[PDB]
């Protein structure tokens, strides 16, 4: 299905007092670089503090590679570098 249609994922930025929840489309055919996906997401969630490094499923599992976006999970929490 990830080969047939771009995946809609929901990213919620941690911290910020009203929590910035965003939907981005990721295409499994065109997303080669995990680092670039992080850079992209940083732009989209308007992360002023530098590029996101840590993202997690709502279960708390850390996302470390592109196949983590294209499995069972469609919602992620992004932790800007200020959180660390």
């Amino acid at each position, epitope marked *: 299905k990830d080969f047939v249609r*771009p995946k809609l994922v929901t990213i919620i930025r941690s911290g910020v007092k009203p929590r910035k929840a965003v939907r*981005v489309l990721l*295409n499994k055919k065109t997303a080669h670089s995990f680092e670039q996906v992080l850079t992209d*997401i940083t732009e*989209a969630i308007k992360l002023e503090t530098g590029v996101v490094k840590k993202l997690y499923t709502l279960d708390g599992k850390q996302v470390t590679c592109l196949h983590d976006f294209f499995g069972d999970d469609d919602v992620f929490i992004a932790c800007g570098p200020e959180k660390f």
Partner: nanobody
């Protein structure tokens, strides 16, 4: 995901129009945009496409038309300069070649 197009309508030959398309999601750098156009009862033809690293154009429009994007506005644009009567068509924006706009009439007299 919905796309909303605007900016169509009538122009004189030689004039300019700018089409816009706004997506109902937050667009990022990797997202692919394209504009297609269609004559009554014909298939849509590719006009321009824009991936992260390339803008590509049909031979007919290259130089005159420019596809561009503004991710902060979740949008893409088709700047159409030096319009010709053969540019008359309904234009359609597509996102990831999967979501489509409803179609915008452009008429060049």
């Amino acid at each position: 995901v919905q796309l909303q197009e605007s900016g169509g309508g009538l122009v004189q030959a030689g004039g300019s129009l700018r089409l816009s398309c706004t997506a109902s999601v937050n667009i990022i750098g990797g997202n692919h945009w394209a504009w297609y156009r269609q004559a009554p009862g014909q298939q849509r033809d590719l006009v321009a496409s824009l991936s992260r690293y390339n803008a590509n154009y049909a031979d007919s429009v290259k130089g005159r038309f420019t596809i561009s994007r503004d991710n902060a506005k979740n949008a893409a644009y088709l700047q159409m300069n030096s319009l010709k009567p053969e540019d008359t068509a309904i234009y359609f924006c597509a996102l990831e070649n999967y979501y489509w706009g409803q179609g915008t009439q452009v008429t060049v007299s």
